[PDB]
Amino acid sequence: AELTPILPFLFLGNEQDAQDLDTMQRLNIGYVINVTTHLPLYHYEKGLFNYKRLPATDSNKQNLRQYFEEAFEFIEEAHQCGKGLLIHCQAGVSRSATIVIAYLMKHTRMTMTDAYKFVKGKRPIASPNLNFMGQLLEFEEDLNNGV
């Protein structure tokens, strides 16, 4: 299991990485975001972490932009509460990486292109679909227009 640490408090992963509970406990993760509709909240019953589900699909019509602001709050609650946070979708990390790249665009002064390749460098498998990439490009233009 490889939980790519995009920041010190931010980890990107896939289906399997959220199951590696030993790994997550070493990283002091206390927050988890499941960006899928069908995967379970692994380790939910254990009472270990707080959870947030962004029920989305790796499709060309799925709107992740709606969840952008909702997930940013979960990440700033972790940073303000001094705890790690793992966002994971499935395999190709198309969905989960789009939200990560967007978190960097809103709070980090980075461009969409700069942030996209920052995450691409740490996790090479990142391949947000063009539907998600258009949202990311539109989120840049919005943010640049005082939005």
Side-chain angles (χ1 to χ4, degrees), residues 1-79 81-147:
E2 163 175 15
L3 288 69
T4 293
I6 294 304
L7 311 176
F9 62 80
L10 202 64
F11 313 97
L12 187 68
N14 54 70
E15 161 172 17
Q16 277 90 347
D17 298 327
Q19 289 153 61
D20 199 354
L21 184 56
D22 289 307
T23 289
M24 299 183 59
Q25 289 174 316
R26 190 201 323 305
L27 312 193
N28 202 250
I29 295 162
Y31 293 95
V32 187
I33 297 177
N34 181 349
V35 194
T36 73
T37 55
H38 61 84
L39 297 187
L41 295 187
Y42 308 98
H43 320 307
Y44 183 89
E45 300 103 325
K46 312 178 104 285
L48 292 158
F49 317 77
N50 300 349
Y51 289 89
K52 167 169 283 307
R53 180 188 289 275
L54 308 179
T57 57
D58 197 345
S59 70
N60 209 256
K61 293 188 68 194
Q62 176 67 46
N63 183 40
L64 301 187
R65 172 78 158 86
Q66 72 191 305
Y67 305 107
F68 273 19
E69 305 300 317
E70 164 168 66
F72 301 161
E73 311 213 310
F74 207 70
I75 295 147
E76 292 281 81
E77 149 168 39
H79 204 203
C81 199
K83 264 295 201 194
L85 191 154
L86 170 64
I87 185 174
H88 80 94
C89 80
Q90 271 191 292
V93 299
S94 317
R95 280 162 298 176
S96 45
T98 298
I99 297 133
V100 164
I101 294 164
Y103 175 69
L104 301 160
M105 289 161 63
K106 162 73 92 182
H107 317 65
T108 314
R109 183 166 173 162
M110 308 212 290
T111 36
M112 192 277 281
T113 41
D114 287 351
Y116 178 100
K117 284 304 184 140
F118 178 75
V119 169
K120 178 89 171 166
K122 302 180 96 63
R123 184 160 281 218
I125 315 309
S127 300
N129 61 51
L130 281 152
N131 174 211
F132 299 161
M133 204 197 72
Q135 296 171 35
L136 279 169
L137 198 67
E138 284 178 299
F139 186 42
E140 170 156 46
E141 90 187 331
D142 274 26
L143 292 156
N144 308 140
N145 309 143
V147 195

